[PDB]
Amino acid sequence: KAKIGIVTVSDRASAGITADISGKAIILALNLYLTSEWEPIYQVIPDEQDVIETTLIKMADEQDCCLIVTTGGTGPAKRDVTPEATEAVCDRMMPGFGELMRAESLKEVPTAILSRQTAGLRGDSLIVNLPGDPASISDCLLAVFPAIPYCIDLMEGPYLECNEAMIKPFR
Amino acid sequence: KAKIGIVTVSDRASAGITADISGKAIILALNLYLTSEWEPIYQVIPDEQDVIETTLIKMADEQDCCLIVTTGGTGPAKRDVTPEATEAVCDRMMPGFGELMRAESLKEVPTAILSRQTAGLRGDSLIVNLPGDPASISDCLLAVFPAIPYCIDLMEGPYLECNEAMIKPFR
Amino acid sequence: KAKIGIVTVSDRASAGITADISGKAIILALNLYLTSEWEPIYQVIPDEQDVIETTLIKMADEQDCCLIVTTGGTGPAKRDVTPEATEAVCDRMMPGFGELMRAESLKEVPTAILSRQTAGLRGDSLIVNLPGDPASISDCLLAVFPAIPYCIDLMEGPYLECNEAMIKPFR
Amino acid sequence: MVRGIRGAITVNSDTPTSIIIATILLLEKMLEANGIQSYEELAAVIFTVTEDLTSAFPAEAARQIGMHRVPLLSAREVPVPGSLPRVIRVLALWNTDTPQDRVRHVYLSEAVRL
Amino acid sequence: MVRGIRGAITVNSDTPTSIIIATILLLEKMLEANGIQSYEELAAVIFTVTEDLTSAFPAEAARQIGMHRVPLLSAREVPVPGSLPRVIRVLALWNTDTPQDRVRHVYLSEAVRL
Amino acid sequence: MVRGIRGAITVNSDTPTSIIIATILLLEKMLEANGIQSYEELAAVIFTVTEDLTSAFPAEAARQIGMHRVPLLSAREVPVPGSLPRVIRVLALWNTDTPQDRVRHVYLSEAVRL
Amino acid sequence: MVRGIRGAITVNSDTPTSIIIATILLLEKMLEANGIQSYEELAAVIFTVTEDLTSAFPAEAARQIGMHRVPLLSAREVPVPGSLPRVIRVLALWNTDTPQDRVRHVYLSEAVRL
Amino acid sequence: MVRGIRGAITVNSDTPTSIIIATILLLEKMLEANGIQSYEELAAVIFTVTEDLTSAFPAEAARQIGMHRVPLLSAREVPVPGSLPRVIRVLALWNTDTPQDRVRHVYLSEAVRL
Amino acid sequence: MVRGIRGAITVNSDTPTSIIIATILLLEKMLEANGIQSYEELAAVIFTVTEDLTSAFPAEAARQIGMHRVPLLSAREVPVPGSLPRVIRVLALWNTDTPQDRVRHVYLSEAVRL
Amino acid sequence: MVRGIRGAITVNSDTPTSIIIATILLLEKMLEANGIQSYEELAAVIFTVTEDLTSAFPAEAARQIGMHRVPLLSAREVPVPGSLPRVIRVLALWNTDTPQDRVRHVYLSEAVRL
Amino acid sequence: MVRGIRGAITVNSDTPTSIIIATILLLEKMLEANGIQSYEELAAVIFTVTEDLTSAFPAEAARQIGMHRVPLLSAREVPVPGSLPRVIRVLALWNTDTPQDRVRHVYLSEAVRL
Amino acid sequence: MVRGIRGAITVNSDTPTSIIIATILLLEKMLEANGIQSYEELAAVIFTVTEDLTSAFPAEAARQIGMHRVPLLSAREVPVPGSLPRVIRVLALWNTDTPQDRVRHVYLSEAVRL
Ligand SMILES: [Ca+2]
Ligand SMILES: [Ca+2]
Ligand SMILES: [Ca+2]
């Protein structure tokens, strides 16, 4: 079965103060998208770059996640360092992901340029940054996910099949 | 009072040959935008990367500028190094600024892809690159400034209030 | 005469298995674009980053190419490293090229965000990444080339004149 | 002896993924807030959506969390000018002796403004 | 053990003042006719409006008489050609052992024609 | 203590004769399947119709089989693109202690696809 | 004894920020070029704008540099086909004995083409 | 040695009677406020009107108070969105040695808001 | 000490050749009638054109007779319904001590009707 | 004694650069596949393009590889609904004694689907 | 040494079944009339269709009778007003020494009128 | 062993008389230039016309000079923007051993620009 990583990056959620509905939303979306068998590998971590790096590396190298989706820590706030941790652990970056997500959100909020999400590849693993806002989660995934199964195809990863009524990937 | 940095990067202007109307334009715009008290910290410097870096660092760390706006040295000309100096002094980058400015200018000039402006954060300071062209100044600021007061909000900086008739920031 | 570099990056083509129609297409396009005298400097190389770097450096520094156009190795495939080799040999990057090419292709394929092309400057040489797909070559060049003669102008390079019926550069 | 439970939530777009997710979140939150232990406690659940949401049935989300044996119905909300856009509303009919003032109603995201 | 109560009333114009007033009148008349003593007796209340009434939520009128702790929902009625225009309909779900034939339904103004 | 009963049926045309007949058939089948012996057992019945059915009230059919003392309400269904056309849906609220998994829901004609 | 001073400047967009800034720049440059020391020397100032500029009054920019006691007037320029777009023109009426050939007129940005 | 005098006034309708009357009132008030004793003191007078006033020439009103030997010109004002509607503006060019800060400008009716 | 000079002329068509020629004729006639000996006597010259004339700048004609060092400005006239079509108007500001009643204003072609 | 040679190729856009390049590629590939050594072997070459390609003549590309002395003709293809978009087709008439089953036809890019 | 063979046929409707059948009939009749024994004798075959026929490729019919190794091309005919509607035309290029006046051309159905 | 012959000619109007005459002229000139002595030498002749010529078949003109036993076909040319208007093009397929560089192609009237 394909293994997909979900990383919630939030001091408040990892401290057990706020509930993590951002992470729950991603899992719900992925369950709606995929019709093929897959195992969610999920973890909540604080906004500490050392921890994030270690987490992403553990998920891609040790636990063998073809796709790792992070949420939170992509803003201009002092503690938001998820993109930096992502850039540190990846050997190649995918500028097209952050470009498209910001492009789709700008039709709504002018403050979409304050978002700093990127995407990259560590070995055969695709890592994608989503914003912390639970409402923005679905719209962000919906924008970039139609390209993700084909990306994973090119890295000899698992062949993800999708629910067409929910989402249509291009090959 | 909020302190805002204006950095004109130009060999000709710093040498006192050409008049700096690019820098004067930014100050005029900011005076039209902001209704809250603020102090302009302004300086003209040559296209020397060591000087630019030192200047930006002095303005953000020592003089405590919440926003620093540079103009000039963002092209493919041999001496244009303002984005490099910016990337050197910032701990986190904001790709969304350069992306949007180039996107708005492409509707006019195809040569908007020759622009290399970026934006970044040094501590609690936002640094934004504007092109040298005085005419392009207003249109570039108008594009990204509606997000700047909220960005500064997220960094516990000064609460900038705006003239709505001139510009409308989103919060 | 102006000298323009064409670099085909492909294991299969350099091994002499597949024919290089991607490289031939670029030369055909450039012959259609330019009405001024120019000399094509062409070479096929594998997807090895050390080789690509050396090749680009040899073309820009030793053979004095004002423009170097590469094709291939811009995808998420494990061996695709052309953008990395490009970023290594350039002193300044041009984000606007990759941004526009992906923007024009997204109107067709959602998988345009899997493209990782960039552009940069090494001294007085502009290096531009094109995808490997022969069909995408014309549309990608057509998008960014109207800015290239003016870019080369700003670096004191050769004054390229164009066939207006084929393409119209802006100055 | 029945108590209604109201819920509401907003979405940022008219897509199936967004509507279903928001509905699931709201439904799960409604059940938890009131301490419901089984779907067997529900007489029925009714949904409404504003006219700017047409891409999906909210009832589909309830079936994603196993509400198969629960009767579901959906309808369109009155399209009042200037009213909050893109709202999914829920009325769950709950078999309980809970006092009216002890029932907990759930308003999420921008729907808090309601 | 629940009994529905139906009500209906017409208005002469699509304005908020008219819709809210008519609804309040109907609601108060529904409660009085059946001898209800407390809002705690109501499981829920559902409203519908015809498509020619869009300026206001009927549910707002119920909150004007203090039905804050009562769950409310509104929807659009089927727009049948030639059917009575500008009708507000109410279905109150009442926790009671009142026999079906002893429940009193309330039809006001031109809605009497229904 | 209430259980909802869901029903659905399709028609081939937007005419009053078709909608009323289909509704009567569905209603009668819903009652029989659950062994209901009297209309007095019904708290209320709610109908929805898709937007391609406007010629008649489904509630009229219930009155054709003597459901005069039963409270009825109708509303419009969400018009989802690609969703099954021309559907009449019913939610009957039934006063019963029947277990949730022992209630029988009725889907007729092309509505079986739902 | 009066001399007119002409100025002109272009903008790249019809926004208030651009028009006001360009006007301020032009005005300041006009005054400096002619060595004017006080606003009291100005009888009046007249502006025109092309029809593609409607978002702002040029006269507002003059008040931003303290020309409150100076009388200002603005009008629309003739919209000639193929003529230079987005031009702000100024005619300042200056109380001076400066010879006609010693007055300095100021044409900025793309307006130099005029 | 010339001083401009600014005036402005609004009207409630685009009719000739209204525009001419308002203009006469403004003109007479401008002259009185500055203590002008003869039309011979005026070099010229320029008018502008907003685009919502087309029925009459303001210059006609000046001739109604005998300004026949005074040169008059009229033009259209810039049509800024959200700007005050229906405004007649005047710029009189006055031959005088009056200091700039001793000239009196006249803003009447709703034009006071300017 | 300034006197305005008014002129006006009509054309039969909206072409550049016609507008420029008519303007030159009017300008030359204005200067001759008042005995002006040099362009240095002119503070400034302002033109207006009716909305049915857009093909050319009147200011261009003044430069055809060497008014290069004279400041020129043009604007659009108010488009009054039923008013004389196709009119070029001129206001020259003349540095002179000529009495107001000794200045000569020039109205040519069909513009005499004004 | 003549044999036709068919070719086809697709493009992703209706631009001259794309059409000419694709045509050159196809033409060169057609010649190589059949071992043609000189343009003198060609009686004539005919092209067709689908209706979604209008920006350029395919015949122009043949002249880019020196087919000046070869007679060329182009026409529009039948616009069948659902048929492959953006196709350039070639029919070369070749003077040869090559058997019909030894002639090699060339289908490139998405045109392979044909 | 080549001879063209012309054919033509009409259809009564723009459907694939009709166009393909008519084409097959015409093609078979063309071959028989001239005594052709093998498809190897054909250099190439060209089709045209009038603008009122778009549903199918005529070339498809030739492949239905095994003309796979024969090169085929199709184009649109000139749409002359009042000209015969719905015509499929064929030009077969035949490798033969047959005299020009001994070649047999085939015109079928209403196409005989041509 | 076949050689194509290209011709082209323009007309000033889309009328039958003009198209037929121009075609006859071109055809006669094509034959004379190459020294053809009989129509029996022609395998076939193909015409194209630009989309701005629809009033007549070019093939009709060939029959006016007795090309009855010669097979003719016509098609529409690609409508390239900015391309030469109103062009009749001819491709004659000639049975000859004439070298490719000894064939004479004929371009008449404004078609010389091609
Ligand atoms: Ca791995
Ligand atoms: Ca600081
Ligand atoms: Ca070099």
C-alpha span between F72 and E114 (Å, rounded): 12
Q: Do you know the residue count of chain L?
A: 114
Sign of the dihedral defined by the CA atoms of residues L89, L95, L96, L101, in that order: positive
Report the residue of chain E nearest D100, measured CA to CA. E40
Residue with tokens 């156009």: C69
Domain enclosing residue I2, as ranges = 1-114
CA A70 to chain centre: 4
Give the closest ligand to the alpha carbon of residue C68.
3
Neighbours of chain A (3+ CB pairs under 8 A): B, C, D
CA C33 to chain centre: 14
C-alpha span between L58 and L62 (Å, rounded): 7
Name which of I58, I54, I65, I56 is nearest I91 in CA terms: I58
Instruction: Assess C166–J contact: CB distance below 8 Å, yes or no.
Output: yes
Token pair of A118, please? 């990127």
Find the chain J residues whose C-beta atoms sit closer than 8 A to any C-beta of C: 10-13, 15-18, 20-21, 24-25, 64, 109
Given a contact cutoff of 8 angstroms between Cβ atoms, the answer to whether L21 and L13 are in contact is no
| Ligand 2 centroid from CA B155, angstroms | 10
C-alpha span between H75 and I48 (Å, rounded): 7
Neighbours of chain J (3+ CB pairs under 8 A): C, K, L
Find the chain B residues whose C-beta atoms sit closer than 8 A to any C-beta of A: 92-97, 99-100, 121, 124, 126, 144, 146-147, 150-151, 154-156, 169-170
Name which of H43, H44, H10 is nearest H26 in CA terms: H10
Token pair of F100, please? 């949730």
Residue with tokens 């971590």: A45
Q: Could you give the 3-state DSSP secondary structure of residue C7?
A: strand
C-alpha span between A67 and A45 (Å, rounded): 18
C-alpha span between A1 and C52 (Å, rounded): 37
C-alpha span between C15 and C3 (Å, rounded): 26
Nearest-CB residue to K93 (from L43, L55, L57): L43
Strands C67-71 and C125-130 come out as parallel
Token pair of B43, please? 């300086």
Token pair of H10, please? 């609004």
**Cα separation values, A123 from A22, C80, D111, I113, Å:** 27, 12, 43, 88
Name which of K41, K48, K91 is nearest K67 in CA terms: K41
Sign of the dihedral defined by the CA atoms of residues B2, B6, B7, B13, in that order: negative
E21: left (phi over 0), alpha (psi -120 to 50) or beta: alpha
Instruction: Assess C32–J contact: CB distance below 8 Å, yes or no.
Output: yes
Strands L2-10 and L87-95 come out as antiparallel
Residues followed by a break in chain C, C–N over 2.5 Å? none
Q: Could you give the 3-state DSSP secondary structure of residue E51?
A: coil
> In the 8-state DSSP scheme, what is residue D86?
S
| Ligand 1 centroid from CA A63, angstroms | 8
Which segments of chain L does DSSP mark as H helices, in order?
16-34, 58-64
Q: Do you know the residue count of chain B?
A: 171
Q: Where are the beta strands (DSSP E) in G1-110?
A: 2-10, 42-49, 72-76, 87-95, 106-108
CB neighbour burial string for C79-110, b if at least 16 within 10 angstroms, e if fewer:
ebbbbbbbebbbebbbbbbbbbbbbbbbeebb
C-alpha span between H17 and H58 (Å, rounded): 11
C-alpha span between J52 and H7 (Å, rounded): 62
> Which residues on C lie below 8 Å from J17 (Cβ)?
29, 32-33, 138, 141-142, 166-167
Strands F72-76 and E87-95 come out as unpaired
C-alpha span between K71 and J43 (Å, rounded): 15
Q: Could you give the 3-state DSSP secondary structure of residue L100?
A: helix
Counted domains in chain F: 1
Instruction: Assess G89–I contact: CB distance below 8 Å, yes or no.
Output: yes
Report the residue of chain K nearest J5, measured CA to CA. K71
Give the closest ligand to the alpha carbon of residue B125.
2
Give the closest ligand to the alpha carbon of residue A5.
1
Phi, psi (deg, nearest 5) at residue D76: -95, 140
Which segments of chain J does DSSP mark as H helices, in order?
16-34, 58-64
| Nearest CA distance, A72 vs chain B (angstrom) | 14
Q: Could you give the 3-state DSSP secondary structure of residue C49?
A: helix
Is residue F69 a known part of a binding site?
no
8 Å CB contact of A78 and B151: no
Q: Do you know the residue count of chain E?
A: 114
Give the closest ligand to the alpha carbon of residue C3.
3
Is residue L39 a known part of a binding site?
no
HSE-up (13 A, CA, CB side) for residue C79: 14
Give the closest ligand to the alpha carbon of residue B61.
2
Q: Within 10 A of G32 (CB to CB), how many other CB atoms are there? A: 11
> Which residues on K lie below 8 Å from L75 (Cβ)?
48, 75-78
Angle at F45 between CA F40 and CA F47, to 5 degrees: 160
Q: Which residues contact D60 (CB under 8 A, 6 or more apart)?
A: D20
Angle at C19 between CA C16 and CA C20, to 5 degrees: 105
Q: Could you give the 3-state DSSP secondary structure of residue J90?
A: strand
Given a contact cutoff of 8 angstroms between Cβ atoms, the answer to whether E70 and E45 are in contact is yes
C-alpha span between H51 and K109 (Å, rounded): 70
Nearest-CB residue to E73 (from D79, D89, D103): D89
Instruction: Assess J81–K contact: CB distance below 8 Å, yes or no.
Output: yes
Instruction: Choose from G69, G86, G88, G97 for mutation: most chain H CBs within 10 A.
Output: G69
At position B81, the amino acid (one-letter code) is V
G82: left (phi over 0), alpha (psi -120 to 50) or beta: left
Q: Report, in angstroms and rounded to the nearest whole number, the Rg of chain E calculated over CA atoms.
A: 14
- 3-state DSSP helix/strand/coil percent for chain G, to nearest 5? 35, 30, 35
Instruction: Assess I80–H contact: CB distance below 8 Å, yes or no.
Output: yes
Instruction: Assess F77–D contact: CB distance below 8 Å, yes or no.
Output: yes
Given a contact cutoff of 8 angstroms between Cβ atoms, the answer to whether B108 and B102 are in contact is no
**Residue A94: Cβ-neighbour burial (10 angstroms; 0-12, 13-18, 19+):** buried
C-alpha span between G105 and G91 (Å, rounded): 10
**Residue J112: Cβ-neighbour burial (10 angstroms; 0-12, 13-18, 19+):** exposed
C-alpha span between H47 and H35 (Å, rounded): 21
**Residue B25: Cβ-neighbour burial (10 angstroms; 0-12, 13-18, 19+):** buried
| Nearest CA distance, J40 vs chain C (angstrom) | 24
**Cα separation values, C112 from C95, E15, F13, K107, Å:** 16, 51, 46, 53
Please count the helices (runs of H) and the strands (runs of E) in chain J: 2, 5
Question: Residue F54: which CATH number?
Answer: 3.30.1330.40
**Residue L83: Cβ-neighbour burial (10 angstroms; 0-12, 13-18, 19+):** middle
| Nearest CA distance, C71 vs chain J (angstrom) | 16
> Which residues on H lie below 8 Å from G39 (Cβ)?
100
Nearest-CB residue to H2 (from G2, G40, G55): G2
C-alpha span between B137 and B20 (Å, rounded): 13
Instruction: Choose from J21, J25, J27, J108 for mutation: most chain C CBs within 10 A.
Output: J21
Q: Which residues contact A76 (CB under 8 A, 6 or more apart)?
A: A114, A116, B92, B94, B121, B126, B151, B154, B155
Token pair of L94, please? 């000639």
Q: Which residues contact B88 (CB under 8 A, 6 or more apart)?
A: B49, B53
Instruction: Assess I41–H contact: CB distance below 8 Å, yes or no.
Output: no
8 Å CB contact of B100 and A106: yes
Domains of chain C: 1-171 (3.40.980.10)
Residue with tokens 């002094």: B89
Q: Do you know the residue count of chain K?
A: 114
Nearest-CB residue to J95 (from L1, L78, L105): L1
HSE-up (13 A, CA, CB side) for residue C77: 14
Angle between helices J16-34 and C21-33 (to 10 degrees): 130
Report the residue of chain B nearest G19, measured CA to CA. B138
C-alpha span between I61 and K94 (Å, rounded): 74
Report the residue of chain L nearest K49, measured CA to CA. L75
C-alpha span between B68 and C123 (Å, rounded): 29
Phi, psi (deg, nearest 5) at residue B95: -65, -25
Please count the helices (runs of H) and the strands (runs of E) in chain H: 2, 5
Nearest-CB residue to K78 (from L57, L69, L72): L57
Given a contact cutoff of 8 angstroms between Cβ atoms, the answer to whether B110 and C146 are in contact is yes
| Nearest CA distance, H79 vs chain G (angstrom) | 6
Report the residue of chain E nearest D8, measured CA to CA. E73
- Resolution attained, angstroms: 2.8
C-alpha span between E58 and A57 (Å, rounded): 56
Give the closest ligand to the alpha carbon of residue A156.
1
Instruction: Assess A167–D contact: CB distance below 8 Å, yes or no.
Output: yes
Nearest-CB residue to L54 (from K2, K48, K79): K79
Q: What DSSP string runs through C64-119?
A: --SEEEEES--SSSTT--HHHHHHHH-SEE-HHHHHHHHHHHTTT-GGGGG----E
Question: What does the H/E/C string look like for J42-72?
Answer: EEEEEEEECCCCCCCCHHHHHHHCCHHHCCE
C-alpha span between G73 and G87 (Å, rounded): 16
Report the residue of chain C nearest A169, measured CA to CA. C110
Are 3 or more Cβ–Cβ pairs between K and A shorter than 8 Å? no
At position C115, the amino acid (one-letter code) is S
Angle at H69 between CA H64 and CA H72, to 5 degrees: 70
Name which of E110, B87, G35, J112 is nearest C93 in CA terms: B87
C-alpha span between J22 and J47 (Å, rounded): 13
Q: What DSSP string runs through chain B?
A: -EEEEEEEE-HHHHTTSS--HHHHHHHHHHHHHB-S-EEEEEEEE-S-HHHHHHHHHIIIIIS--SEEEEES--SSSTT--HHHHHHHH-SEE-HHHHHHHHHHHTTT-GGGGG----EEEETTEEEEEE-S-HHHHHHHHHHHGGGHHHHHHTTT-----B-TTT-----
